[PDB]
Symmetry: D2
Subunit: 511 residues, 4 copies
């Protein structure tokens, strides 16, 4: 039982689907007497390859909490593993994956007298995480079984069941430049590529990618960073403002060239797409340019898993409701290797910036509430507390001004099983990327892919990188409707079902 489109504007031929969408856009003009709004229409012609390509995913930090869990849970879902609990049994699943478990509203059906909600994955064909082949790299040589014991995410029973699958997996050696992460990671680094020549390093990872692509005969290769937060590099012309600059800096063995820069470069040069799950500024302008030039997609930055995903939806809801956030304070503590890394200042900066950034476009949205567009007091803390381990603790206070100088104070406590929050997002980023790799649209009689910097991934990310000269969009539910309208437009059935006027009017006969 599939979901089948009936439209004069959709044509299947050759296992691709062509889909004409008329886009409604307002155009503006500022005049002495006020703002003139001209609604215009823009016919898009989409083609979508309907068969998902054979897909490999390469994780940097493959042996970490997220990495080993991402891998573990795929196996666990493939074999439908269960484990005993005090309550009975639990079973493997993919909850908290937008792609695997969100449903989408197509409208209302009179016959069944029902709102119609379909699984996201039924709209345009997409991968299941079961279809992802995964390798990658780690500065630690621990196999993915020891890696699970390290992480403390799966209950003991489930680690034992997963043992014959995870244990054989030992990550490839990686680039280690001690100066780009928390100095407390030295002890752990026993699986590193020899030498200090960064171009030999570049070539070594290139070599790693091609063989992976060959050895499994993959048609889509995605590389994704889920290793420790690096510090920021400098950004400047001479170093990394252009593609040719970044390539040259690698050739002459420049210092402000990170391990994460070299992976991004090795990925692009090999036609693999690259996702940045961490706060560092890997996707400098030189990199984006290099991706534009090589026809590959980039994404980032920084998983939006817990306290910020909430912040994202809550500050939107509050400004939409006519309420002025005055004070936002966000404490966090955790005891995993992620926290021990963010013990150090330059790494905590990477993360502080990306956590602090998500209420900018909202404060700018509303000049009644915010006449001077001044952000509210906004404070972001992360602390390393070994005891709670992977169970991060998000403690937040929101203070708003409401009607007649009254106040409304929300205090919040949020238990975030970080790895269990993060992994599904790793599956979604990979999955939406392969899908985007299958979409094209008419530019001028030839078909073109979307921009390289694939901002539609924003709902998954804290600090979204976006095509040059366009606005950042931080409010989660808004980022979700971008995604769900897009796939319905691809599939042939977008609508105005956010305003079901049929319910309070008599519905005009169809044209």
């Amino acid at each position: 039982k599939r979901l089948i489109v009936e439209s004069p504007n959709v044509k299947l031929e050759d296992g691709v689907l062509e889909s004409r969408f008329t886009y409604r856009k307002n155009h503006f003009e500022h005049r002495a007497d006020g703002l003139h709004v001209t609604p215009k229409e823009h016919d898009y012609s989409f083609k979508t390859v309907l068969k998902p390509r054979k897909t490999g995913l390469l994780l940097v930090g493959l042996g970490g909490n997220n990495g080993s869990t991402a891998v573990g849970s795929i196996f666990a879902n493939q074999y439908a593993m269960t484990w005993r609990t005090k309550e009975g049994h639990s079973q493997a699943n993919y909850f908290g994956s937008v792609t695997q478990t969100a449903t989408v509203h197509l409208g209302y059906d009179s016959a069944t007298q029902n709102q119609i909600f379909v699984p996201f994955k039924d709209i345009v064909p997409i991968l299941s995480p079961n279809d992802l082949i995964i390798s990658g790299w780690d500065i630690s040589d621990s196999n993915l079984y020891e890696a699970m014991g390290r992480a403390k995410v799966f209950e003991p029973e489930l680690q034992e069941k997963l043992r014959p699958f995870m244990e054989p997996i030992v990550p490839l050696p990686s680039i280690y430049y001690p100066d780009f992460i928390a100095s407390n990671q030295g002890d752990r680094a026993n699986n590193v590529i020899p030498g200090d020549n960064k171009l030999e390093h570049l070539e070594h990872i290139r070599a790693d990618i091609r063989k992976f692509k060959q050895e499994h005969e993959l048609e889509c290769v995605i590389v994704l960073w889920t290793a420790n937060t690096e510090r920021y590099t400098d950004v400047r012309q001479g170093l990394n403002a252009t593609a040719d600059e970044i390539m040259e800096s690698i050739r002459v063995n420049e210092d402000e060239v990170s391990p994460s820069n070299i992976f991004a470069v090795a990925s692009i040069l090999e036609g693999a797409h690259y996702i940045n799950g961490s706060p560092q500024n890997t996707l400098v302008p030189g990199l984006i340019e290099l991706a534009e030039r090589h026809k590959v997609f980039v994404g980032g930055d920084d998983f939006k898993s817990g306290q910020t995903k909430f912040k994202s939806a809550f500050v939107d809801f509050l400004v939409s409701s006519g309420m002025k956030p005055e004070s936002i304070v966000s404490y966090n503590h955790l005891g995993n290797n992620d926290g021990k890394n963010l013990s150090e200042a330059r790494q905590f900066r990477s993360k502080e910036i990306s956590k602090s950034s998500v209420v900018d476009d909202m404060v700018k949205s509303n000049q009644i509430l915010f006449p001077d567009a001044k952000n509210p007091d906004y404070c972001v803390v992360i602390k390393y507390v070994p005891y709670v381990a992977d169970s991060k603790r998000a403690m937040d206070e929101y203070i708003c001004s409401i009607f007649m100088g009254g106040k409304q104070t929300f205090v919040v406590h949020n238990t975030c099983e970080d790895s269990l929050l993060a992994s599904p997002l790793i599956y979604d980023l990979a999955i939406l990327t392969e899908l985007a790799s299958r979409v094209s649209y008419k530019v001028d009689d030839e078909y073109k892919p979307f921009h390289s910097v694939l901002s539609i991934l924003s709902l998954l990310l804290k600090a979204p990188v976006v095509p040059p000269g366009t606005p950042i969009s931080n409010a989660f539910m808004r980022q979700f409707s971008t995604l769900t309208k897009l796939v319905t437009a691809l599939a042939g059935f977008p609508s105005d079902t956010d305003m079901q006027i049929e319910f309070f009017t008599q519905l005009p006969a169809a044209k």
Copy 2:
């Protein structure tokens, strides 16, 4: 500086605005091989009177916390009253009014390199709460100054400034049927219409409305219930299933006919619209039918001010994110007259039902998460605690199941200045009603108003009453996009700006 539409589909003539909107709706067919989706278009032709009518608002419970505050704050905003605080000064405002302070997204402007957000009130002309003339009724004869001292909402200073405006106002006597509210209200009731003949009562309120409409020469009269929560009436044929039944029950002095039924009837019979701000089931089928027959709008039920407004946006965000709510527990305490009334069981039922109801359409939306469509454990408590007074305290626990049988627990504490939350919503309900009273659309060559049961008011209400045979919609942000798309459609400039594809594509030339 107004907001000016430029469209071949919009025409001003005679101070009304005609607006053709093409509505995108999916139509469904269930077949052996799956679900067939046919996108169709429905041309709506709207007319919107552009000058807001002269508008009176009549509140039942005029002397209560909400009532006296609603009135107080209008005056306070008219005269721009300030009061000293430890911090400096505060000034009157209308924060927490969607209509007065929400902004709306029309799109992106290249020249200014900017997202375009306009005040809701700039899209189609609507009232300001300053333009509302307000009277009403109260079983307590206390003037609106003593009423402010009672309520304990405005700081002392602001009650003194408001004294020469509020003090002269003494509410009209009301219908009091002791058996429909908390028996603890007996002491307070010293301003009641004599007798036990309910038809004489009906006539007395009718008399009250006409004179108000006459005495201020009003073109729109809205009646709104913000008195104490009554218990539910029985519902059955013979009593109140039809209009003729409800009229007859009033004539023969039936018992299961509430004070709130008589107001609703007095309102409709006089061409005034009627809003129910409380949990009771005033708008029984007989009443809706009577409103349909008299060409008046009804609305309800129960202000969605605090803990439920949040619940509404948060459970949506969580199911959209691929997360299964397992347990929702909602405690509440307050010390105002609202709480003292909800001390009693039949009144607490009214409210419990409407608070508990808001996660039904969401659990039905997602059959991956909820295969058997079974709501999570859901518990709603309200307690009378004199000390906190109007400062209600909402304490909530949400427990969700996420990826791989992991859990995510959110604990929440929410300081809700109920009256300061509620009043702005009283201004919004009135205001959207008068606006709807100005909209018509083409049915079959003649123009018709929307359905009497005006469900577009849902964002303001906990337990929305909706046109017979159509689904309830509980998720706040979804209710807001219904409203903002509608007014943009009226004004001439609706769009697909929830998916700004211009940012990752080359924008096709306009057609």
Copy 3:
């Protein structure tokens, strides 16, 4: 390495220890000019049997959450059972037992330059829970293994290890009078003594006790109620004001005679002591009198395990600090059989009263703060929420008035693993009882035991029953110092170590 007393006031003879303690007590006289305080001394001569007696414990509700856990954990500690966790291993222990894990301050030692803290159990010899032999009764015939699966307290692994010990244990049939508990317990009751003759019931339990005492050759038998909260009986002369009244009511088959009354009677008549772990008013005056007459100890009421244990220490700390509690609101939810029973109103009353009672003696303690001795707003809620199961959730708000009409608000969230909180308290109540059964003191040349109503158990109990005509003492830390001073007085080494004046003075030579 024992703890050895060196005193002219202590004598061992025959395995009992004689201990003379000089008690400092103020005596008062009210006069026109004020309050006259006369300090006097009272020499107590204690004898303490030093060898703990062979001890059986009989639980009513043996198959419940507390019961099966109490039993499980004894076995688990006897065999030093471990279970795997994500973190490593956990091992059996007795944490949260005052007797097994509190330490006591005897003073400061110059040689080691150290505060001297010894285990409570080192002061006077007391049982270990490993030395307790346990049987009892349950209306449910489920064996203690099925009983563990029911309760959901121990992790699966630990239930399997405990299986060959718990599985053979099937509780004796009990008295079931449907009318004294939540009607929702009918289904569960398949293990009941036949008939409606309450005197035959009385005799049947008597029979149960003697055989237990015989079959294990016990020198101390304690009976303890940890079955479902019953409602309150009436209290009146004719029924249960005296011992002879209560015996007669059982003979004539009176209705207001509870199952818990019959156990208390069967216990006393057989020389077993009786502890009431639940809210019901089992220990009516007739019962106390019967215990006085039979030389047995009674105790109750209601385990002080979680939210009330905290409340107890926090309200004391706050009134001692010069702070006026103004508002205390205490929400609770749980999903165990305890909660499902407290779903019903008469059972929730039992518990509401005992939870609400703990700030009386403190508000009376301070007439500066509380001139009119009026308790603050105090609200206690319990809700049945299946999902959280045994993991009760205590949500509290304390609002105090402080300096200059300022306010201080504490909001609290407390995860209470009820069974894990309760069981250790079952071990402490039994253990302090057997100890008290070993203490006597000089009345008038013959040695006497303490009063039957053993109030020293108060630290463990919410609603302490106390010898007639004496004050209730609710503040936990105060209840703890009663206990620790007493055992040091017994052992020979009490002190003024709450005021170690040696540290800021030159210490006078010993006398």
Copy 4:
């Protein structure tokens, strides 16, 4: 109506009260076979001057939040000032002062059938804060009225009433060494003693003290630091290990000599006592020695006002209950000048250390719970958030291990009106100091005062400084019983009323 002692051990002569107290102390000996405990008695002979001396208090940081509030509230209580609130009126008081509002338990009175609780201030005569004459110094010349507007503690109305009292008060100029506080304080410092000669500075403050003592004819002068947290000085021989060292360092104009060192020195040299309300290490060994030599009392460090006062009582309660704290996380945010100062790292260290220190003596108390005496994970955060101002927000998580490896998690939110918490403590420190200045005891036929380092002030302080070679005592309720036993011993009526054995025994005839 006074409180009148009746004892053969108490004698009034010449307005002093002589009081013989027999102190019960255990003495220890470690032997092969175990611990031998020898209870001994130590007769103390106290003399207490009964008339409180005429008392001046000099505050450093007189113009701060605490300072201006401390002064404001004295006036406010002298004149019984009220202010309007939404609720009615509030009146001046001294809540949150232990000395002014704690009550003390002397025992039980049979005639009235009552526990006897008396005000602390009724036991031995002590000052009322109304009797304190207050001046001091501030680097800011703002008068105490502008100082109130700055602080934002009193409601506007109360600042106006206090205006003619506070406005005339302009603090004396102070020592400003920019390098000892947050560099962000430069702007504020417009009231400073000229020059960089620290000995001239020393002399200038000496001059300030003598004239204050002269001008009001004071018999007790107390100097108290409540200015901004300085950083720590170095500590070493050569600099400040001895009195002669510290005097010399001032003479030769040494750098590591703080402004707070010079005040402490100016105080001692003038026979004024000195209290340190802040985290810095003012009372280095050289200073204590100088106080010992000059027969003056010192106290510190750091007001224990809010989150730490609670921590202090809660960790005690939890270890006494047999519970292992595993994780303590303490977040704090505030927007006052205190927070803006603790923005900077060296100042935040001062405070972090003193907040983190309070669970040491408790973890050492219990080797069952803590076999290896390893403190739990313990994290202390302070953040500068302008918006909340003086309303600091304490957010805490306590995680304990309980019975059978179960866990208990307490999450806490605490609204701390810092200035309203702090000031009463300023009144208590001064007040207990003047009282101690009136107590002496027999050393060897002559009477001596207590040690200079007056540790009995500990209940008021976070990081108590104590006589060399004696243990720190951190648990609040324990610190309170030290104080209340001491004053009852002074007054003639100490007791064993923490164990009222009369209630479960027959009370032996008095000896």
